[PDB]
């Protein structure tokens, strides 16, 4: 349903994310299916990525991974303050899949320290 | 980035009420406050005011609550976060106290406490 809120599209990061304020088989019918099947088929894209960080059910979920600054060197301030989730994304868009993977291992990893940690 | 080109350094005499521009690029012109400041030659640089470029709200200097009228036409945008903006401030009963290098300047970020803090300047008009 709501899947649209991009409302704070053109807002600063910080202003956006940390404080908000029966078918026929004809052209219409193999149409509309695909648009719902494509529609889940990238709903799952990023559930599943949120579960292998330990996001699931998350909005905003902190982790174990470092900054590292050759990423980008700006401040919180200037970030936050001053950068919208627009642009951000394409400043950074190149080391996107380096921290998906390093993510991925941080929680891994998280996940047997919990089970030497149970263990006792 | 962004550059922010002032007017011409032309001369009056008192009485008179001239008309400073500054004409932004390179950056969203409504996303910060464009800001005026005056450095006398005998006194101190003063603060003169900011305006939203988009709230339209302007704030100046108690030296300056009645002699100083302070404009901004619409931006022309340019791209997605590019813009083109012009910045206009006049003053009132004009001497020649008022002689001296007139600044503007875009503020800082857009949020925070540090908003309107002038950061990028232009190119200074002299008056005299």
């Known amino acids: 349903v709501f899947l649209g809120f991009l409302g704070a599209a053109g807002s600063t990061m910080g202003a956006a994310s940390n404080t908000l304020t029966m078918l026929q088989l004809g052209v219409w019918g193999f149409k509309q299916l695909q648009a719902r099947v494509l529609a889940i088929e990238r709903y799952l894209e990023v559930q599943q990525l949120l579960g292998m960080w330990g996001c699931s059910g998350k909005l905003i979920c902190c982790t174990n991974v470092p900054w590292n600054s050759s990423w980008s060197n700006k401040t919180y301030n200037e970030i936050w303050d001053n950068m919208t989730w627009m642009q951000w994304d394409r400043e950074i868009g190149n080391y996107t899949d380096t921290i998906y993977k390093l993510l991925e291992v941080s929680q891994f990893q998280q996940e047997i320290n919990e089970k030497d940690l149970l263990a006792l | 980035q962004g550059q922010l080109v002032q007017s011409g350094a032309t001369t009056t005499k008192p009485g008179s009420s001239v008309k400073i521009s500054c004409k932004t690029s390179g950056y969203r012109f409504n996303f910060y406050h464009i800001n005026w400041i005056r450095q006398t030659a005998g006194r101190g640089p003063e603060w003169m005011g900011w305006?939203?470029?988009?709230?339209?709200?302007?704030?100046?200097?108690?030296?300056?609550?009645?002699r100083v009228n302070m404009t901004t036409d619409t931006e022309v945008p340019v791209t997605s976060f590019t813009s083109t903006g012009a910045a206009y401030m006049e003053i009132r009963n004009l001497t020649s106290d008022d002689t001296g290098t007139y600044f503007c300047?875009?503020?800082?970020?857009?949020?925070?406490?540090?908003?309107?803090?002038?950061?990028?300047w232009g190119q200074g008009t002299l008056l005299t």
């Open positions: 305006i939203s470029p988009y709230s339209g709200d302007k704030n100046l200097a108690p030296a300056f609550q009645d």
């Open positions: 300047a875009k503020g800082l970020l857009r949020d925070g406490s540090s908003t309107w803090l002038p950061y990028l």
